[PDB]
Write a protein that binds this DNA or RNA. Structure first.
Lengths: 146, 207, 63, 100
RNA sequence: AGCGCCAGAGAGGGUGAAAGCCCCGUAGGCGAAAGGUGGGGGGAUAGGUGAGGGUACCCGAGUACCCCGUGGUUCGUGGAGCCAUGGGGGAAUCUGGGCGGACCACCGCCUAAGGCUAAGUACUCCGGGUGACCGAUAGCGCACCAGUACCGUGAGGGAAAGGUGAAAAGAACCCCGGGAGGGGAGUGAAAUAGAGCCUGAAACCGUGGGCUUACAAGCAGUCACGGCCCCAAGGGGUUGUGGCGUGCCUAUUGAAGCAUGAGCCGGCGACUCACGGUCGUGGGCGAGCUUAAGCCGUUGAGGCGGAGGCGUAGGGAAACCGAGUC
RNA sequence: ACCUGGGGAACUGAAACAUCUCAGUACCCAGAGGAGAGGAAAGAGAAAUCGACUCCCUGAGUAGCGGCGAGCGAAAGGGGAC
């Protein structure tokens, strides 16, 4: 094209400001002029006052962390059929993940809004709704025995 | 969308021509192109700017003066950065400069590359190469009747190392294997010239 | 390097969806305050205005 | 090692500056300085030395070393770069397509 | 400036200034009597090579195991196992013994109390190659006869200092002078290049010249007229009166302030980078977006690589349910 | 320098401080070598599962640990090197 003028297009601005000048931000440097604004402050976020934070609010989050750790339990990834009818044929796990949602997300439970069309759709779980919804014409593939 | 290239006579058969969508003069984007160049010219940056910090220096830690009744200014070790001999404050530390420019862009960039050059008609798909056993002469001779007197810089790319040698030494030429095509060099040179084979792989890289 | 999430905050606050910080009600925590008053009743969850902007920033990774 | 250069105890041609072109015999090779000598710049000193043994000195002095890169070997013609031939036994050098 | 030429060689350095073709080299291609190294490709030893049926002989001891005291692990006494082990007690040999987070029971895993074992990994005294690395107050503490001089009983601390010229041609001889230094002479492109010698800034000390001052009171200047000195319907330099005028910085309610700092000059000298994150913004792509490490090429070519990660549904402590949920 | 073992601090952080933190870091000592260490399951952990060890990328600032403070922080599994 041309080595010359191929540069940024109205916004590189790789021009940070320098607090050491004599006009603009200066002396005190990009604002300051007091103390405890001199080489690091406590937080703020959670900390300070030396008061109580708001570590005052009680941890309701119960049933939380025993010790060996988490409990290996079956997770169920959710997917509406309004994102499902996106295609047709025979929709089942794997067929997803490899596309759309899931990705080893484990159990596939369909459900949702929209209005899926007829096409036996395998899964692990459906909604009292999700079922009836495609009950109009679809599939009841399910569980496992192995 | 304007795409007629310039096939290069093999032997007796004339000069045909090919073509390819936005893969030719379409919507060139100056910025993106640049973006790709920065990235290219940064990643290649051999970052080795070292300077010794305060503790990095080679002095003792003794406290030069008693600190309180000398009139002299208060001081630490001769390593203090206000001590001449001292260590640099925010000197440069050896650091890397690369980052991962979006592939889908890294390519769309090579697109605009080849493109532009072709839209200005400086793109040329060659084929006929009478140059053998790497001989500067033979090559120069070729280019002559090839329509390249050495006025504009020429990025030569071919899977033929022998031709490679041929121009491997001409001041007005940048010889480059086909798999090495890159927006920089493309842009860097005034005229892109490549073997049909080459143009294919570049095409394989995106059809 | 990789800010660590503030456990305690995580242990006591659930951040909804639209970006609201929600936690319990101080006061009733197993009374300890004692003998009722129909107040105990009024203890569900709540929105921490202006202090969540901070609360939130402590869970940058855990989300 | 790697100290070796062109001309040796033989006939050379300057091409320096102040003596640009002035065929002359041997230079008495340096080489730990890369100087020739030849017959070019033959500056005169104040001949006496460290000890005025035997009367004074003189003002007809001698040759000024002269940088080695400024001279060139030569034969039937001018300048001409050295080159090497096998001989089918030993080895010797011969100017570009002329020999000797 | 004019005609050429080589190029698998237009990297670089050097030559009195800016050379592909002058010198050393560069691409490319050859070389080892000798001594190291060397499964990358091959030879040879060492050693290793099956299946059923029976006794009920072996299968690592102060060990396991239990208890007291501790250590390691994300585990801080916890419901606290496992792996280690100082103290006490103290087995069994496959109907054996340990483990899968107290303890049982199921179900399953593994064979403790003997040992060795390449590679992929770490580092940089040492050799080489590169650098949007420094260029003598920098870069190593040392570009130089530096871990020196000097300092300290000692451990230890720890400097400064680089550049004549292309070439010594480095100033014969005469003169002044005890010498040193100079004046001529002479070399050189240049000597205000003459030797701790390129360039040579500032502070600071001088000589000469111009304007100006010995009745006048000042942050030293500014405004205005007038006079003197170098070019002319203008400008410079200076300044005799007149008018007006409390330094700079910092810190403060408030400083000329009799509050802090500064002798003057010249150098060195302070908002950085890495990784997370959050807004904004310039772009790619969009129900999708994107790669890590690593492999392949390159030798200042980029490819490949979907493990993984955001996002597509939220509620609820959880079970769980789901466009709902609590 | 790097490595393994035996010993092993405090300042700091917690806006005091004693648990905790810094940190098994600094340092001291022994030993190993071009590396050292580790290494062929009395393993892992839920998978009809895996199959010495080490190194990198993930997993993951997750699981958890914690005057449940400050703060600390895995492993399996998946990619690679070998």
């Amino acid at each position: 094209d041309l080595r010359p003028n191929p540069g940024a297009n109205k916004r590189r601005k790789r021009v940070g400001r320098g607090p050491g000048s004599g006009h603009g931000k200066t002396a005190t440097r990009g604002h300051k002029g007091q103390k405890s604004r001199s080489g690091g402050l406590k937080d703020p976020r959670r900390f300070e006052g030396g008061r109580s934070t708001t570590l005052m609010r009680l941890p309701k989050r119960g049933m939380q962390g025993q010790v060996p750790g988490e409990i290996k339990r079956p997770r169920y990834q959710g997917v509406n059929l309004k994102d499902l009818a996106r295609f047709e044929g025979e929709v089942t796990p794997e067929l997803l993940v490899r596309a759309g949602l899931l990705k080893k997300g484990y159990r596939l439970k369909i459900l949702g809004e929209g209005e899926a069309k007829p096409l036996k759709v395998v899964a692990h779980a459906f909604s009292k709704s999700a079922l009836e919804k495609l009950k109009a014409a679809g599939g009841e593939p399910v569980l496992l025995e192995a | 969308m304007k795409e007629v290239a310039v096939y290069q006579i093999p032997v007796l058969s004339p000069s045909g021509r090919r073509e390819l969508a936005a893969d030719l003069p379409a919507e060139i984007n100056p910025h993106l192109l640049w973006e790709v160049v920065r990235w290219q010219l940064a990643k290649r940056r051999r970052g080795t700017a070292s300077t010794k910090t305060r503790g990095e220096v080679a002095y003792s830690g003794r406290k030069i003066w008693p600190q309180k009744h000398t009139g002299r200014a208060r001081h630490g070790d001769i390593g203090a950065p206000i001590f001449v001999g001292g260590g640099v404050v925010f000197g440069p530390k050896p650091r890397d400069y690369s980052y991962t420019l979006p592939k889908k862009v890294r390519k769309k960039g090579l697109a605009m590359a080849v493109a532009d050059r072709a839209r200005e008609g400086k793109l040329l798909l060659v084929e006929a190469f009478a140059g053998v056993n790497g001989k500067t002469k033979e090559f120069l001779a070729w280019a002559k009747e090839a329509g390249l007197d050495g006025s504009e810089s020429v990025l030569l790319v071919t899977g033929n190392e022998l031709v490679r040698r041929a121009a491997r030494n001409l001041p007005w030429v940048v010889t480059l294997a086909p798999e090495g095509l890159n927006v920089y060099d493309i842009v860097r040179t005034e005229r892109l010239v490549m073997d049909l084979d080459a143009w294919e792989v570049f095409q394989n890289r995106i059809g | 390097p990789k800010m660590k999430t503030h456990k305690g905050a995580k242990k006591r606050v659930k951040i909804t969806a639209s970006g609201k910080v929600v936690a319990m009600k101080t006061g009733k925590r197993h009374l300890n305050w004692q003998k009722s008053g129909k107040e105990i009743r009024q203890k569900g969850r709540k929105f921490v205005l202006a202090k969540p902007e901070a609360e939130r920033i402590k869970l940058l990774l855990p989300y | 090692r790697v100290k070796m250069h062109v001309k040796k105890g033989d006939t050379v041609l300057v091409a320096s500056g102040k003596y640009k072109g002035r065929v002359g015999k041997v230079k008495e090779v340096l080489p730990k300085k890369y100087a020739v000598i030849v017959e070019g710049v033959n500056i005169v000193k104040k001949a006496v030395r460290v000890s005025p043994k035997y009367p004074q000195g003189g003002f007809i002095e001698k040759e000024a070393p002269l940088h080695a890169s400024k001279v060139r070997p030569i034969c039937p013609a001018c300048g001409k770069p050295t080159r090497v031939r096998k001989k089918f036994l030993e080895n010797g050098k011969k100017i570009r397509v002329c020999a000797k």
